[PDB]
Amino acid sequence: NSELIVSTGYGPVQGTARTSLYGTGYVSFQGIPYAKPPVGELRFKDPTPPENWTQVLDCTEQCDPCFHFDRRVNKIVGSEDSLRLNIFSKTIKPTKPLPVMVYIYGGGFVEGTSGTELYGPDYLIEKDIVLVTLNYRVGALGFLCCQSPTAGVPGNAGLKDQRLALRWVRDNIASFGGDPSAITLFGHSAGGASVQYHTIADASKNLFQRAIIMSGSTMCSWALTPQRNWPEKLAKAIGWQGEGDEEAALQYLRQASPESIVDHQEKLFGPQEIQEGLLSPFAPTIEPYESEVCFIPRSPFEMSRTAWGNSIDIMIGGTSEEGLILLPKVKPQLPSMLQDPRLFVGNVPFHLKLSLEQRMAFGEQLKQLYYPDSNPSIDNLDGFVNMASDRIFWHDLHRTILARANYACTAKTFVYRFCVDSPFFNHYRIHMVDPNARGTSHADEISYLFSNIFAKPLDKSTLEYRAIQHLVDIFTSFATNSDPNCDSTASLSWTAVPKTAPPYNCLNISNDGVEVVELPESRRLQLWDSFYVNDALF
DSSP states (O other), X not given: OGGXXXXXXXXXXXXXXXXXXXXXXXXXXXXXXXXXXXXXXXTTSOOOOOOOOOSOEEOSSOOOOOSEEETTTTEEEOOSSOOEEEEEESOSSOSSOEEEEEEEOOSTTTOOOOOTTTSBOTTGGGSSOEEEEEOOOOTHHHHOOOSOTTTOOOSOHHHHHHHHHHHHHHHHGGGGTEEEEEEEEEEEXXXXXXXXXXXXXXXXXXXXXXXEEESOOTTSGGGOOOOSSHHHHHHHHHTOOOOSOHHHHHHHHHHSOHHHHHHHTTSOOOHHHHHTTOOOSSSOOOOSSOOXXXXXXXXXXXXXXXOGGGGSEEEEEEETBGGGGHHHHHTTTHHHHTTOTTTTGGGSOTTSSOOHHHHHHHHXXXXXXXXXXXXXXXXXXXXXXXXXXXXXXXXXXXXXXXXXXXXXXXXXEEEEEEOOOOTTTOHHHHHHTOSSOOSOBTTGGGGGTSBOTTOOOOOTTSXXXXXXXXXXHHHHHHHHHSOOOOGGGTTSOOOOOOTTOSSOEEEEEETTEEEEEEOTTHHHHHHHHHTTTTSOOO
């Protein structure tokens, strides 16, 4: 125990010894506060550093997550005093400072947790890295935005939470054996868009040295939301009676319970928002005035062009059937959507400067692209899933890749593709999409990087165990060498994205192993690029 007390600039903290699923010893620190508790009058406000402490802080147990509806346990969970992070490593006394990997969870900016029931360190700590996971505020508690500069709620509090945790890691990880000059930032889905947000915002300039963006991007339309009087609409739904005064709505929201906020924050959309494909009112937003910390001062599309992260190496990727995640959302209407004659026309991004007739012609190309020799139906969904994969995830990952080939003058960009398809170990697909579905859903790769409550020790001769080894090796090799070429890819030449990039290669990770191939989605994504004839691809 005493060996596991670490003195930090804020005070001492006490960790625990742990045993992985595979019998490997490692050390854990959980619930280290990186911010002042955002409670009372500090609710919705940008975070600030915490007060020092002198007594040894007990960090031996998993802390509470931020407030959200936890779909796994089907109840609101969390605490407002949740701005904390966790540290994992085989030992906190390595012979030499170790590369550091900092994970930002997904969950649509409305849910998520750093708990080890989803993001366990067991597979990553087999390598010589320090793993950091962290909580950041989600929902309206994390993404409220008020227009008045006097109200003190400029927006993006959850991104700024992430920023403060990243600053804490830079300033303190050396006390735990981590190398603060060798930090990899990585994250999936909304966490992947979050990673990219840090690489494009001066607010997080040089907090880390390289990044891994997984199945989410600031280029995704769902990574940004407009402001349309959400605080008043939210306070109304909870029970507020006044109207027409945003600061009065903020006051009501600050006296409302956290549970009432979580319970109503997803009930605010009108018909205009459902057509535009908006995920939530409470998401990253362009901030209406400049604060002490201004995370998103302008269009993220414009921020990406001059991103400080254009100078750092980036790995980016996704799965082969990302769009499987759309099926549970639309399952009851699916017989009617698959038969709707606007099915394909309605997938042309609505914001593009295209006439109805231009859109109808593109819709016909989309139909020939995804359904050349058959018609959509509940028993013929592959083309529909592929369309969804491209619309929601892969076209905007691809736009990021092309932006990298144009704007990253010297840094390297590597692309991966994950299509491992296990009958039992693709936990997200099995437990959240369909028990009978095959393919590689959005979030299936997480099962091969992090242990979770469903994971059991795997027989080391299985494809599933080999897929863990491959994914952990690629990710940790990138964190250690800024190059994901490793022993698992020894016989191949995994090349970075070339300046001529509109075609580029990826490392394709499948049941059989690894291979370097042209992006399989290249021909599909050529059509999507063509929609931007009157707009800017990047």
